Each structure stands twice: as C-alpha cells, then as structure tokens.
Amino acid sequence: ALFEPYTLKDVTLRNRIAIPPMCQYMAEDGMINDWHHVHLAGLARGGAGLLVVEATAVAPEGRITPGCAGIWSDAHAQAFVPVVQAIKAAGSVPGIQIAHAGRKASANRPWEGDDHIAADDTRGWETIAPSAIAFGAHLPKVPREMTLDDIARVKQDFVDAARRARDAGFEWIELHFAHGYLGQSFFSEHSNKRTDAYGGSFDNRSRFLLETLAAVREVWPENLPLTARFGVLEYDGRDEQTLEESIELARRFKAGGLDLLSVSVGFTIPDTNIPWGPAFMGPIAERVRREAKLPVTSAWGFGTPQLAEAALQANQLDLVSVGRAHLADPHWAYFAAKELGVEKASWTLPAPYAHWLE
Amino acid sequence: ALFEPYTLKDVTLRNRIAIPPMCQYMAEDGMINDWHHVHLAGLARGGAGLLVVEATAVAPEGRITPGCAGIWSDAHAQAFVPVVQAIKAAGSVPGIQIAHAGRKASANRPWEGDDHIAADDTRGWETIAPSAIAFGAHLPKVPREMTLDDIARVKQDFVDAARRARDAGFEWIELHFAHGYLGQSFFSEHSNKRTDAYGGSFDNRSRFLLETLAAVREVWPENLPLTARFGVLEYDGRDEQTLEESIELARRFKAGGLDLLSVSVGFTIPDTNIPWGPAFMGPIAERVRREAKLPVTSAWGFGTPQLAEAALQANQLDLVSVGRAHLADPHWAYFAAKELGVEKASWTLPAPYAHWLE
Numbered sequence A, B: 001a002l003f004e005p006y007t008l009k010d011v012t013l014r015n016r017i018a019i020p021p022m023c024q025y026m027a028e029d030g031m032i033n034d035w036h037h038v039h040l041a042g043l044a045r046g047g048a049g050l051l052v053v054e055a056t057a058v059a060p061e062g063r064i065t066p067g068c069a070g071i072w073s074d075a076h077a078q079a080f081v082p083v084v085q086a087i088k089a090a091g092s093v094p095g096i097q098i099a100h101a102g103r104k105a106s107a108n109r110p111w112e113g114d115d116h117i118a119a120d121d122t123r124g125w126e127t128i129a130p131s132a133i134a135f136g137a138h139l140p141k142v143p144r145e146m147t148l149d150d151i152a153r154v155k156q157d158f159v160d161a162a163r164r165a166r167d168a169g170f171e172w173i174e175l176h177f178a179h180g181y182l183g184q185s186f187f188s189e190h191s192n193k194r195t196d197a198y199g200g201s202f203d204n205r206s207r208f209l210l211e212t213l214a215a216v217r218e219v220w221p222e223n224l225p226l227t228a229r230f231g232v233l234e235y236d237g238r239d240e241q242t243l244e245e246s247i248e249l250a251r252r253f254k255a256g257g258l259d260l261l262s263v264s265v266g267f268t269i270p271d272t273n274i275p276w277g278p279a280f281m282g283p284i285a286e287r288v289r290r291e292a293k294l295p296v297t298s299a300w301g302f303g304t305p306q307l308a309e310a311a312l313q314a315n316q317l318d319l320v321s322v323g324r325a326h327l328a329d330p331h332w333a334y335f336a337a338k339e340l341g342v343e344k345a346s347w348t349l350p351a352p353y354a355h356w357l358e
C-alpha cells in the first residue's frame, strides 16, 4: 500500500510517502539558499512521492525565527524556482507550506535557545495575534492584538504567497493552520478572546481560517491539490469538545475546496499532556477522515515502515508523512521498500544508485 | 578509531571515513551538472571526512562512457568550482580522481549494456592503449597502440587535469592507475607487449606511471595530499609475483612523493577468480602498507561499521573507503557513529538535522 500511486486533482504521486514540512532555519532575511536546494533535491531523489517545503512565511513578522524561509516578495519566490525544478526532475511532487507564526514568532533557532528573542536583540520583532495574550513558558512575549486591517493584510499576504508558489512551479500547497501559529490561534478559545467578527462563536473563530482559504482558492489552480495542516485537539482536558468543533471546521474546509487535510495537534498553549507514541495520531486522523469524509495524512513515528503500511491498509490515512527519518536518511523510501519486500526496491532510487544496489 | 581525525600534509580530515570515487554516468560531453552538485554536496553533509569525486577523464577518449565526467578543458574544470565550495562548506575535504580508461573506454553505461559501444553508434570512439590487444568478453574492441607522442600527450593531459583540479579548489588528488584502465594496463604484462622504453622490463612497465606522477607533482601543491589508486594483484594465478612487483612500484611512488595509496585489484583481464568477501582486501592492503611503509586505504564491504573500525584498529588501513553504502544512505557516517556508540553521534550531521536526532 505504501508504494501504490495516489492521484489528487491532476497530480499523481508515485507512492504514498510524503515528506512533511520541516523548518531548516537556514534562510537569511527569508531568502533560501544552497542549503535548501541540496537538502530538498536530495530528498526528492530519495524516492518520496511528495515533498512539502518547510513553513515559508507570508510576511516578515510571520517567520518563527530569523532563519525561516519567506515568500513575501517576488524575489523570495523566484529563489524557489530552481529547487522546484530539481524536485520535479527527480520525479517527486513539489509542495510548499505557507505560514504565519503569530504569537510564536520572533523566536531563537531551536539549537540557539528556542525561546523568544530578547527585547534588546536587534534580530527581534513585535508579534501579532488575535488577542494580546502570551503563550507563556519559553515564549513569554505578549503579542499585539490585530486590527481588522491587520487581518485584511495577512489574508492578502497568504493570497500573494499562494500566487507566488503557483508561479514558482509548486504543484501542491498547504496552509499552516496548526501548531499554535496564527491560524490555529484564531480558532482556539485559549488564544482568541476577540469580541468582533473574528472571535467568540465557532463561526467567528473559524472566520479567519475560512476566509483565508477562500481567498487563496481564487489564485490557486483548481487542478492542483489545495491542502492545509490543522491541529484538531490540544490534549488540554477539552478533547471531545475541541475535536467535535475541529471536525466541523474540516467539513467546512472540504466544502470550501480543500482536497486533503494534514491532521496534527494544536500546541496552542503549554499546559497540556500529549500521549506521545509511535503513530499515536492514527486514530484521531482516522476519525477526522471518516466524519468529514476528507482525505488525510498525519505524522509522528511512521519512520517504521510496517507502521506506515499498517496505517494505509487500515485506511487511517491516505498519505503517510515521515519527517525525522528523512533527516537521518534522505533515502528512507528505499529503506522502506526493502523492509516491505517491494519488488526491485532499489529502483525507488535513480539509476546511478539503483543499478548498484539491486 | 573510525572517528579520529587524520592529518596528511596540510589537510586534516574530521574522521577516517572516505567516500571513494564513484562514477555517476550523468555528465554530458564531460560537463558535470546539478546531478553531481546535489549528489556530492549531499554526501559531504553526511559526515564523511573525505569525499573523492568520480573518475574524471583527462581527455575525451579517456572517458569510460558517454556519461563520464571530464576535466580536459578549463570550462570543464570551472564547472567543479561550485561543487568544491559546497563540499568545503559542509566540512568535508574535496578530492578528485583523474583518469583515462584506456582500452576499456568507449563503453555503454552499466545499465545500458555495460559493453563496448557498437561500431556504427555515433557516440563511440577509438580507444588507445599500450598495445593493440583487446580486454575481451564484453569489451572486445582492439585498441590502437599508442605512439611515443600519444604517451607524451596523455602525460600532459594528466598534468593539465591536476593543474585544473588545483585551481578549482580540490585539496586532495588521486591518479587512477587501477581497474584495467590506461595506467594499470601499462604496468601489466597481460596488456603491455611494447618493446620500447615503455614495455618489457619492470622499469619500463612502471615508466608511464612514474613519469605521470612526477609530471603531476610539478603542478600539484606539495602541501596537499598527492595519491593514487593502483591494482596490486589480479587473482590470475600470478599473485605472489604480481604483488611483489606492485609493492616495489609502491615504494617508488612513495619516494616520488606519493602520500597515500588506494589499494585495489587490477581487473586488467577477464579470466580471473577474485575471492569477493567483506573487507577481503584488508590483508593485501596491510601488506602493501607494511612493506612499502606507505599510508593506504581500500574498499569493498566496509559499509558494516564494525568492520571499518576493526580494520583501523588493526592498522590494516589509515582511511576506510565506503562506497555503495553511501549510495544507499548518504548519511552513512551518522549510522556508523550510532553503531559504534560515538558520543553525540547525531552531530556527525549539520545542526538542522543533528538537533532533532539527538
């Protein structure tokens, strides 16, 4: 099952292995470079059917850190062209996750503190969010409450980002509405205390996300997969209520043209108790897939080939996202093919490699 | 031992893992491209201390196949510059093997026949060698016997190639005098039947190789490792006599400025019986190292970490060459570090990967 092709709209993936977006923190002023080119081209040659580029900021203040990639200008977008072309040359589908970090923005790289940048550090910047409330813990900075014009501008930033991704050659797009960043924070009652049209009720909290999706849909080709990542629960003691609302939003996403949903955890606040475990997201993703009748993918621990295979065979997911295993071994798809006893497993790789490994 | 640094001349390798030259057959008219750039940069980031670029032809007719890389012009050399710089940026030492296929030239890619190109194929060309005798088997073409001027020209081609490698930024060079190609064929009595100064006696058969080394030494920096690969035996029923002569030549190489010898098998003729096995070259390399008092490396089956470690600890080799395992997994060095229980094994890789794998 892991090596069966998958067709969504006009795009066909050679297998069900998806490399989820994984920040590299190697960009400068949002511009990607040879780190990203080699990293991504190398992964594409590894055999995966889909390669989704890391969270790319739609605006400067939407970066998580000073090392995050951006696509807030045509120059930023053009930098992606040679990479997109190399990914296609390798036979993998090029995708990209566009995002805005919201209150979790202006933070240090993970190996450089992983915390909000100091007030007197020249690299930092003011964060924006639905309400002026801090995440807490290692991200204590209180963000600035967005005005209606800030909301209009951020939506347009997402539109510009999607238009740029389209013209750069990407064939798959993912809106980052998860992990406590801007989109996720608008949906969660923990972070959204607004009393206007963008806060309060389920309809109001969903508004920013739905309007952004609709706005993006106007510029994103209808024959190319339009997707999003969304945290459907927080493990904050309100899981049943939260999951029910999240599933309802997933239904609205589908009706609004979403082709597939990447199911994740919210990470909206720090006071939670997440039951980490191999493929622990499987059951949750399956319920969303079933109740919203929408294709899904999920991640965490699927680097074990048999787990990926099992999840697909049980129809818990349509695509299996494998992250860290690809950082350890960019040719994981080849390792997986061997593990599952696929015929001519070495040919998951290009001839220059395959010929000698068969 | 595998992760102990190694200093040769002014160059210091971060560990004892060497990626031996491995043809990719992806060049066009000798010009390398993004296949090579991503392939090599990716391998450098994998952690290996030394990365030796594939056999690069010193002349067009010296290519093994139409897909072989070349460095017979300054334009060809300049194409290597960005790759060399990416390898250095990753902290690996950039090396390159310069070569001339001799009678084994003008052959099809391994996955496209692996045999001598048909007479009426527009991609083929006449081969040259010490004597007009064919390898046989899948390489039946009888090569043209070289004139003294052909020999003078090929030597100059090696000099030009080394000068170009130097100016491109390479910090390690390897002369390809093995695997039945031109250099190896001049030394072997099987292929060399000349009756002039370049054939007959041990001194005459060694002449082409020694003169080429001396010529290259004039342009190659004295503070950068000058090495060569040489087949010390053929497994043709004349191993003791052949090994004795090969060791004597190794002594002449050392006296002539060779800093390290990559020990291999001759592959000069097809009628042999090679005892393939994991690290089977270990004992032979050790004897050459001991009797010629020259640093050495060897390959075949060292992809098993414990074998590489064992070979180093027993002083059979100074560097361990790991080939195919790197095609399967460009991050083999990381796999090896874990296998051998190295402290902070994930940091064999760059921060963007290491931080998440520790």
Ligand SMILES: Cc1cc2nc3c(=O)[nH]c(=O)nc-3n(C[C@H](O)[C@H](O)[C@H](O)COP(=O)(O)O)c2cc1C
Binding pocket: A020, A021, A022, A023, A024, A054, A055, A097, A176, A178, A179, A229, A299, A300, A301, A302, A303, A321, A322, A323, A324, A325, B352, B356
């Ligand atoms: C270095 C690194 C960068 C990541 N970057 C992103 C990102 O930009 N956007 C996102 O939605 N998830 C991101 N994630 C979470 C991964 O996409 C994935 O869901 C997670 O690693 C769990 O899968 P795994 O167990 O296969 O690694 C990242 C994870 C790591 C380790």
Ligand SMILES: Cc1cc2nc3c(=O)[nH]c(=O)nc-3n(C[C@H](O)[C@H](O)[C@H](O)COP(=O)(O)O)c2cc1C
Binding pocket: A352, A356, B020, B021, B022, B023, B024, B054, B055, B097, B176, B178, B179, B229, B299, B300, B301, B302, B303, B321, B322, B323, B324, B325
């Ligand atoms: C694709 C491929 C290309 C190779 N190219 C070269 C070359 O250009 N020059 C050379 O001396 N040896 C070459 N070799 C032989 C390797 O350097 C190495 O000695 C051999 O693969 C044995 O080591 P391994 O068991 O670790 O793969 C090649 C081997 C493979 C599989």
